[PDB]
Amino acid sequence: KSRQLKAAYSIELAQDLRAVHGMDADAELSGILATEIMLEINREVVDWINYS
Amino acid sequence: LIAFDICGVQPMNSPTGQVFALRAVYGKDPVAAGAKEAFHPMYGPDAMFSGQ
Amino acid sequence: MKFNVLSLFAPWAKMDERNFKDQEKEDLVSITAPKLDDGAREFEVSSNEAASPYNAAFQTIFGSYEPGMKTTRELIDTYRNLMNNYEVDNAVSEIVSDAIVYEDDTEVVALNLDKSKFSPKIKNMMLDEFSDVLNHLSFQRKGSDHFRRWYVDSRIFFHKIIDPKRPKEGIKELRRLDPRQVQYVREIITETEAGTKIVKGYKEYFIYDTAHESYACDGRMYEAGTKIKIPKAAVVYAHSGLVDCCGKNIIGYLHRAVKPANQLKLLEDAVVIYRITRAPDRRVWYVDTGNMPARKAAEHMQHVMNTMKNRVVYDASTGKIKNQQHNMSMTEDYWLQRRDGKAVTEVDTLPGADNTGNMEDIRWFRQALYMALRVPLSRISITRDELTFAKFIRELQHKFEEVFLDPLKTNLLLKGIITEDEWNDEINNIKIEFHRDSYFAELKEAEILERRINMLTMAEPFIGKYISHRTAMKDILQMTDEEIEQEAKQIEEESK
């Protein structure tokens, strides 16, 4: 069974984030999404254990 | 093109720039309608202010 | 959000902050193209004077290195893939082995200090530190391995450490960093009319990746996520002068051989396969079975094909035909049954793997590769090939050498013995000399001397009127005036 997340953020936002906190946030969004996937899996595994 | 030597440029390092300016004023309230300036290239000074 | 370096590196960062603070006051201004020849990759950034916190720096360091960091990783593996092949590895071996030797009861590569110094105490201090530099590379045991990897990839990096509370004596064993996770750049954040002509420090930034996300072999990790920004003061490194046609896209010493290395391998396999495929007798047996669907026609075929079948295999462990009885038939006597009164049922034979070479191209290409890998081509007295080889080895040694010079000059500053200014205004020469094979060195010298001697013996009949003795000694024996005087003095002493 499949899983996935989208970010697809704008250019202008990234251009400005860079000028405020020095963040490109490609990395931040990428991080968050990948993180969210791994964490959701973390729970999936735990939940399957508790369920079974 | 006549690019930019007939204007200021002050290139930005962020969106949203700002500029502050000082005025010399009087009448016990530097900020009021009717407050008067001390210096102005187009207007003579209030010659009686420190005087009679 | 304006984060600093992990504090463990801060002492190195501090050294760099000082280095840049003074570079920024330098008069290397009014420069069009950046004053940079090699090493770290340059990039035009945000023109914001001193705005270089971790987040911001990452954004541009990463953006700068990214469009080609993949390529960089591919080249590392490409060079390694060549190193893993035969008739490649041996070229590298010949070079590495001669570049760094260790010998029987001899010294090892060592610092040669023969220039003026304030006090000779410094020569001892530098030599003592140098020895310890080698201890921190464990050069005496693995120096040739460092070199080999360096050579193949054309770069090596090491992480330097400090106490850090007493950083002056925190100097300890270096840890070799695999380029796979190392990024290096030069960033520009100043601006003037029509570009940036301002003295630029570039900050020499390094980044060390995290998870072993990329790989050559399997057993890889999950996403790296963030990466760590590291000061250059913290990294010992060296690299080749070989760069591809753009930027700082540095290449390996074997880069040249990648084409023919792979090409030869394809040719070699083409030969191997050519002679195997079709080696055995080949044919298709045909059975004419009228008015039948394959599901039934097949029985007619079985009545022939499973009757005439030669159930034979070859024992490759013992060169025999497995369970062959009788030992050998005199004739492969086969038959085919024709149900109709027509010569149609037949056997369709095929050609085999005939030996028709003319196996010449393989040598053309072997030789091209052999040379592409860095001659002498004499390997399967003193010649031009050996002489140019030795020059090459010295050139390699002089780049590799930085691996010692970096931590040496660093340690001698960090422990407060010599100032930075003194080092820079003094050498001018800090050459580290290698031990070279004495077998060959003696032979080279002996042959040269024979010729010199033979020439002295030609001058002899005329030397009494035509050639001074000093002249014969400086021209034929290539002796220095002092050397000449010293032997003359010794010669009178030898009388007794």
UniProtKB/Swiss-Prot annotation, chain B:
The gene is gp23. A proteolytic cleavage by the prohead core protein protease gives rise to the mature major capsid protein during virus maturation. It comes from the Viruses. Belongs to the Tevenvirinae major capsid protein family. It comes from Enterobacteria phage T4 (Bacteriophage T4). Homohexamer. Interacts with the portal protein. Interacts with the capsid vertex protein that forms pentamers. Interacts with hoc; one hoc molecule associates with each capsid hexamer. Interacts with soc; this interaction reinforces the capsid structure. A total of 960 subunits of the major capsid protein forms the 160 hexamers. Signal peptide: none annotated. Major capsid protein that self-associates to form hexamers, building most of the capsid in association with pentons made of the capsid vertex protein and one dodecamer of the portal protein. The major capsid protein self-associates to form 160 hexamers, building most of the T=13 laevo capsid. Folding of major capsid protein requires the assistance of two chaperones, the host chaperone groL acting with the phage encoded gp23-specific chaperone, gp31. The capsid also contains two nonessential outer capsid proteins, Hoc and Soc, which decorate the capsid surface. This is Major capsid protein. The chain holds residues 106 to 157 of 521 of the full protein.
From Swiss-Prot, chain C:
GO terms for cellular component: host cell plasma membrane; membrane; viral portal complex. Pfam families: Portal_T4. It comes from the Viruses. Keywords: Capsid protein, Coiled coil, Host cell inner membrane, Host cell membrane, Host membrane, Membrane, Viral capsid assembly, Viral contractile tail ejection system, Viral genome ejection through host cell envelope, Viral genome packaging, Viral penetration into host cytoplasm, Viral release from host cell, Virion, Virus entry into host cell. The keyword Endoplasmic reticulum does not apply. Residues 472-496 form a coiled coil. GO terms for biological process: symbiont genome ejection through host cell envelope, contractile tail mechanism; viral genome packaging; viral release from host cell. The keyword Membrane applies. It is found in: Virion; Host cell inner membrane. Residues 486-496 have a biased composition (Basic and acidic residues). Homododecamer. Interacts with the large terminase subunit. Interacts with the major capsid protein. Interacts with the capsid vertex protein. Forms the portal vertex of the capsid. This portal plays critical roles in head assembly, genome packaging, neck/tail attachment, and genome ejection. The portal protein multimerizes as a single ring-shaped homododecamer arranged around a central channel. Binds to the terminase subunits to form the packaging machine. Attaches to the host inner membrane most likely through interaction with host yidC and forms together with chaperone gp40 an initiator complex to form the prohead. Belongs to the Tevenvirinae portal protein family. This is Portal protein. The gene is 20.
